[PDB]
Design a protein around this ligand. Sequence first.
Ligand SMILES: *[C@@H]1O[C@H](CO[C@@H]2O[C@@H](C)[C@@H](O)[C@@H](O)[C@@H]2O)[C@@H](O[C@@H]2O[C@H](CO)[C@@H](O[C@@H]3O[C@H](CO)[C@@H](O)[C@H](O)[C@@H]3O)[C@H](O)[C@H]2NC(C)=O)[C@H](O)[C@H]1NC(C)=O
Ligand SMILES: *[C@@H]1O[C@H](CO)[C@@H](O)[C@H](O)[C@H]1NC(C)=O
Lengths: 61, 530
Amino acid sequence: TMCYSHTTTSRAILTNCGENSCYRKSRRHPPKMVLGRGCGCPPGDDNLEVKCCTSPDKCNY
Amino acid sequence: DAELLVTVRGGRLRGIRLKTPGGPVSAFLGIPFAEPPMGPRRFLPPEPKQPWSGVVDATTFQSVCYQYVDTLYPGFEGTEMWNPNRELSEDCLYLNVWTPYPRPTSPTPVLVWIYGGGFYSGASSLDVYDGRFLVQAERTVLVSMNYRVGAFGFLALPGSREAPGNVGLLDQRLALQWVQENVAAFGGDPTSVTLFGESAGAASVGMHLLSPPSRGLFHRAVLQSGAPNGPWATVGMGEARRRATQLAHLVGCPNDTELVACLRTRPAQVLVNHEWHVLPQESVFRFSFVPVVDGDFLSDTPEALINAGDFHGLQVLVGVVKDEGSYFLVYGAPGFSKDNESLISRAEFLAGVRVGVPQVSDLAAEAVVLHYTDWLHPEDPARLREALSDVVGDHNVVCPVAQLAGRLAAQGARVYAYVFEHRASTLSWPLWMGVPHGYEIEFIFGIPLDPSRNYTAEEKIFAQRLMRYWANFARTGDPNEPRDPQWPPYTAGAQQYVSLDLRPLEVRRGLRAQACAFWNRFLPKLLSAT
Ligand SMILES: *[C@@H]1O[C@H](CO[C@@H]2O[C@@H](C)[C@@H](O)[C@@H](O)[C@@H]2O)[C@@H](O[C@@H]2O[C@H](CO)[C@@H](O[C@@H]3O[C@H](CO)[C@@H](O)[C@H](O)[C@@H]3O)[C@H](O)[C@H]2NC(C)=O)[C@H](O)[C@H]1NC(C)=O
Ligand SMILES: *[C@@H]1O[C@H](CO)[C@@H](O)[C@H](O)[C@H]1NC(C)=O
């Protein structure tokens, strides 16, 4: 799968996650700032919400 | 040209000339004004740049101050146009000078730009901040600096020397001092300096008005869409110590000296990773590290200083866009997205009120709902969308600004006020957002004059009309084009302001007067009792 990729301090690029899943890290409560996008499916937390997905392309937007 | 060569107190510079439809302009980009605040200097007040041998390349912009990058909407211009357009660095204290070609012979009035971005972001190199058209069209000198944002600029352990706080405002002040001692080199008059800024930039401006060590550094102020007395603009010593201590726990940091010594060893990115965690509640239009009321830079709260202050001798220009609130709602208010028309239900509206008005009793929220519901149309989605837009915009911007303007005008200052009501034809945000936060800027700098951009003809004229208003204010303290429609001062009684759009000057009354009484007079009485 083709998903977005970036940290807190880099612009969003496209990357080939492949058969893995994607993720969208964000602040759980408002303001819901996006803090990350990439490959895999990492744990979130009280302050960090993670959203996972598998398809289609650009699904972690 | 020998006009692209200039000598300042610290050494020689080599500028670049810039093309514009009306003629060339000389630019000096990325002049160091401070010793780079890295290593053991992170968090400290800035130190002045030491004299250099040789010629400094001032042809290009310098590094952006280390910051979070807003990536809500990947590939979207509406958010990306505010993002860093140069590599991030802690070595970021540089400023920029634009001056007419040829260099003026008589000392010309200076305009200093302080950018906004919620004290967590921003940069002097962003395209929308280009000095070239304003300097060419009006022959003033234009200066703009980078100042430290986020933790690097505003993390405070109040009372400590290792992290006193407010150091990004001190960055701004150092650049202003540089202007006093170097601006003649470019043809500028240090006895005529006007500060202007948008959002956090405007809040910054307002704080320089309230901090005596800054008063010798400028003569006039323009505050666009922001005010020091905004609920997002300052934070107490209690909260600021809590927030910085939270952050130090997140990055693993065990005595205030030990705490900052530890913090200074962490890579910049590790600090930005954790910035958003330390925010207390659920809210939009709230930022982690902002200016602290510590007794130093501010001797009291912005409100107490505004109320007590003497402002004779001052000209201030203040204003707001038509829809201050709308931009922020997509950062967490239920039902809001830029990818549809956000026609929310009443249930979403009520939940959104709690988000756009953080930290209040349930009773206070019912009061807001009371005032902002049309009881003839209590459930109409479009109206509920505009109303929550107003709630957030009024609380955070229009009503702080309006109160500031009334207190200044009554206490000496000569005040002029505007509302900016033109939606740019090139605007990339949807139509329900209207004229949002920060979309008057591109016209004030006359970005529509740029050939490579797709602005209409009436907008080119409009922009030049605006640049004239702003330049007239900088020269004389009066935007009025002498002579023959006229823009009247704002006073607390008559409360006159002007609309700025393609149509000519229209004079109205009351900056959202009914709402402001709720926020400034009643709400405080309610919270002081419940
Ligand atoms: C206008 O847009 C908003 C925001 O939706 C966003 O834009 C859309 C085009 C899609 O790409 C969405 O994925 C995207 O978030 C819409 O509001 C959202 O509606 C959905 C349901 O339609 C909400 O999801 C639900 O969440 C609850 C828990 O809160 C769950 O129980 C449900 O199972 C379901 O997942 C979502 O929370 C909400 N987004 C938020 C938080 O703002 C809105 O419906 C849309 N209006 C239209 C379609 O005209
Ligand atoms: C102006 O509009 C044209 C339409 O074809 C487009 O190709 C170009 O990229 C636009 N330039 C901008 C957005 O400044």
